[PDB]
């Protein structure tokens, strides 16, 4: 879908006693399972996408809250952006005492009707003003025949859920270990888009996974001036960009209210609230003072207008991988401007890969920025993983240093090791061989930070303290490697350290 | 600057290491000082960062009444700056220690993610480290294996990960260290994939134009038997045009202390272009691009030209 549309998601639990207070074991509880799910996807969505909408609803309860079509349904929460007080409302109903806390309020086991329940949720999504990209309902019921004993009750539901799917709201399901069996082919076969224990999907809602997730958006758009005249529009996209702990919002102590940092500039002698025109900019050199205006400290540092000018072609081997400037950015075509320029770009991509070549360019991302120099290395897609595109096809902008960047480094000379000293090393290295994958690690600080932040947010008992994956697991490095550190200590240097 | 440390492949075995930054995206030494327009003195301005509560200009005192918060969904939660430090992830040391090794294949070009590059060297006058580290990197020169390493410059600073990538020069072994992404620094998008070419046709005559462009506009010419091409435009040897332009203005405004600013001095364009013989080669292969490919419009925007003379 288009950029702005929120994900929006409504959670809809069976309040019926026959599942709600029920267990075959003692070790879980289907309502305590669903409520855990709702709290846990919701705490995922809080860290990861505060912009996307959640609601939660109980059907078949005995005391009601709805706009209309009231009987035996209670909207615990209408659609809203997610936060702490909503997670505290769900927390109240959890656990062995929780399954009594709920009973003092909304009441349990009464008759219900899916064609009314699906009506209610529909009205909910309608009532909200925002643009929605995905509209999804989640069923937390075990009741595999949903009391369609009256087939002329049940045909209402099936038609109404035809009407859900027809209006482009989706609906989705989880089965919840009903004693002895559950089978979708009896009923729910036509409500969703051979026999089950409990859903292999449901564990994915307990991943508790944390990052920002920020959708595909351009960094900027530019014209690749091949010369004085021929241009194509290309996008500039950010495939790799270091995340930061979110900017902290300064607060008033006594009320927790936000407060305005309200900076001014004041003459050291006198009451002049000096305006931006009152003051210049300056330097000191050679015991004299150089004076420039607030226009020209940024008229200096201009050279060009926003574009990419072609500088001719190179071998890919001469672009030496030791000197690297800043993270590489992707280039991909954009018919939003310069229509049909995709036809040129695609031929340019295809044929550079045959030539074993890069294009060299001068790059300005904005007006009032100096040109850097950038090699456009061409790119090719590994769809072989059943069209999981690990690599999009296009170009990489790889940046190149200038003289000033390549800092001087001290004198040293040696070519010291013998073939035995390499030969022992060639063993330890081959014993320590694993497979790195790009996603195999996580930031120890930024992951810890969210766990501290949750403890403070919910008033939990404890910070979760989940230990990081960057420390070497040194006992495994002792054992897999084995004792071979002694080959350095014996064969390579004296015993004095 | 010098930094002393201890390269550590396993719990018992440490080698002395002292790295130096090698590429750094370089910034000018002296900042633009702020000065009063008529007195020309750099201390007649005080910068009051005053505060407001919005209840009709109740002005706060930062030393008593302002406490940082973070943001958590639809609501704010107060920390204390003095209690983030109680709970913050603290590194146990100023560490450098290898996690393991794996092929050049595990580490593609694109992903490299650093502010800087280190060159990571055997400590000065440690002849035991010199033999041990020359063994280390000579044992990486031949397997195509690379290292993966936890790093940290100093205490309190963030822990760090990534690729310690070896290379060779006749006078010393290279093993640079570079940072690689964590799982949340990496963005995955399915860009609509271009080999499905049926709506964006690359026809025989278009391909047969481009076939000559990318050989014709070559900078690297084969005037050699070393298998190294002429390196006709050595961009890493060029000085930064940002600083040439800055000092050139500071010169002109020093020698002519009330006059307006000059154009870009022309030899800077002559250096920063890539012009000479390559433009004499290009013009004809470019002339067949103009016809075999379409070039539909783009808009233009204006400047001080929107009200400037003649």
């Amino acid at each position: 879908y288009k950029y702005s549309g929120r994900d929006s998601l409504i959670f809809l639990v069976d309040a019926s006693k026959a599942m709600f207070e029920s267990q075959s074991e003692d070790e879980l509880t289907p309502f305590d399972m669903s409520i855990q799910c709702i709290q846990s996807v919701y705490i995922s969505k809080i860290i990861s996408s505060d912009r996307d909408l959640l609601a939660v609803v109980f059907y078949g309860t005995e005391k009601d809250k709805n706009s209309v079509n009231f009987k035996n349904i209670y909207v615990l929460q209408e659609l809203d952006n997610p936060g702490a007080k909503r997670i505290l409302e769900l927390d109240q109903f959890k656990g062995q005492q929780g399954q009594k806390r709920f009973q003092d309020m909304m009441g349990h086991g009464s008759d219900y009707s899916l064609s009314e329940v699906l009506w209610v949720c529909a009205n909910l999504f309608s009532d909200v003003q925002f643009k929605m990209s995905h509209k999804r309902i989640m069923l937390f019921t075990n009741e595999d025949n949903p009391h369609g004993n009256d087939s002329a009750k049940a045909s209402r539901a099936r038609t109404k859920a035809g009407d859900l799917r027809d209006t482009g709201i989706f609906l989705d399901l989880m089965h919840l270990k009903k004693p002895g069996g559950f089978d979708i082919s009896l009923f729910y076969r036509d409500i969703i888009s051979v026999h089950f224990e409990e859903s292999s999907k449901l564990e994915d809602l307990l991943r508790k996974v944390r990052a920002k997730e920020t959708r595909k958006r351009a960094l900027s758009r530019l014209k690749l001036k091949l010369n004085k005249d021929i241009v194509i529009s290309v996008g500039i996209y950010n495939l790799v960009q270091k995340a930061l702990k979110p900017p902290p919002i300064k607060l008033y102590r006594e009320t927790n209210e936000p407060v305005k940092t309200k900076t001014r500039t004041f003459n050291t002698s006198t009451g002049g609230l000096l305006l931006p025109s009152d003051t210049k900019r300056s330097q000191i050199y050679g015991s004299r003072q150089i004076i420039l205006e607030k226009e020209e400290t940024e008229e200096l540092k201009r050279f060009d207008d926003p574009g990419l000018m072609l500088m001719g072609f190179k071998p890919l081997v001469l672009l030496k991988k030791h000197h690297y400037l800043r993270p590489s950015l992707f280039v991909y075509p954009e018919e939003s401007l310069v229509i049909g320029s995709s036809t040129l770009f695609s031929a340019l991509l295809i044929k550079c890969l045959e030539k074993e070549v890069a294009a060299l360019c001068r790059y300005t991302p904005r007006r009032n920025i100096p040109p850097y120099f950038v090699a456009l290395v061409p790119q090719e897609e590994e769809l072989d993983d059943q069209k999981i595109q690990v690599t999009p096809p296009g170009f990489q902008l790889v940046f190149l240093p200038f003289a000033d960047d390549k800092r001087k480094m001290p004198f040293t000379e040696k070519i010291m090791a013998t073939p035995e000293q390499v030969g022992k090393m060639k063993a330890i290295v081959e014993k320590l061989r694993f497979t790195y994958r790009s996603d195999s690690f996580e930031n120890p600080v930024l992951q810890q930070h969210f766990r501290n932040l949750e403890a403070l947010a919910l008033d939990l008992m404890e910070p979760e303290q989940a230990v990081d994956l960057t420390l070497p697991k040194v006992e495994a490095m002792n054992k897999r490697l084995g004792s071979l550190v002694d080959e350095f200590k014996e064969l390579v240097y004296p015993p004095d350290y | 600057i010098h930094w002393p440390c201890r390269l550590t492949i396993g719990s018992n075995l440490s080698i002395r290491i002292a790295a130096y930054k090698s590429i750094l995206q370089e910034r000018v030494k002296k900042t633009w000082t702020v000065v009063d327009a008529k007195t020309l003195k750099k201390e007649d301005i005080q910068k009051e960062t005053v505060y407001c509560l919005n209840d009709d200009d109740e002005t706060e005192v930062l030393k008593e009444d302002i406490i940082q918060g973070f943001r958590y969904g639809s609501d704010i939660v107060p920390f204390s700056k003095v209690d983030e430090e109680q709970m913050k992830y603290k590194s146990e040391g100023k560490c450098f220690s290898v996690l393991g090794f794996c092929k050049s294949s595990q580490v593609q070009r694109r992903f490299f993610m650093g502010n800087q590059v280190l060159k990571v060297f055997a400590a000065r006058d440690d002849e035991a480290a010199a033999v041990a580290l020359s063994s280390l990197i000579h044992a990486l020169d031949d397997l195509d294996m690379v290292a993966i390493v936890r790093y940290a410059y100093d205490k309190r600073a963030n822990p760090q990960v990534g690729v310690a990538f070896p290379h060779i020069k006749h006078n010393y072994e290279c093993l640079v260290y570079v940072q690689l992404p964590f799982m949340e620094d990496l963005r995955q998008y399915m860009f609509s994939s271009l080999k499905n070419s049926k709506k964006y046709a690359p026809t025989e005559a278009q391909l047969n134009a481009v076939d000559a462009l990318i050989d014709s506009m070559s900078l690297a010419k084969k005037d050699e038997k070393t298998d190294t091409l002429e390196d006709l435009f050595p961009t890493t040897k060029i000085p930064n045009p940002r600083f040439q332009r800055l000092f050139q203005c500071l010169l002109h405004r020093a020698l002519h202390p009330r006059e307006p600013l000059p154009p870009i001095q022309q030899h800077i364009w002559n250096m920063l272009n890539p012009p000479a013989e390559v433009t004499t080669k290009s013009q004809i292969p470019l002339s067949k691009i103009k016809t075999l490919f379409p070039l539909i419009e783009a808009k233009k925007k204006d400047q001080v030209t929107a009200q400037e003379i003649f």
Binding site: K45, V209, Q386, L432, D439, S440 | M190
Partner: peptide, 23 residues
């Protein structure tokens, strides 16, 4: 389609479970 797309956060590609060094 389903195979790579997360149920917690749709359209976005499924976050695999952190890994690390393991020979």
């Amino acid at each position: 389609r389903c195979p790579g797309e997360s149920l917690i956060n749709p359209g976005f590609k499924s976050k695999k479970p952190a890994g690390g060094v393991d020979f």
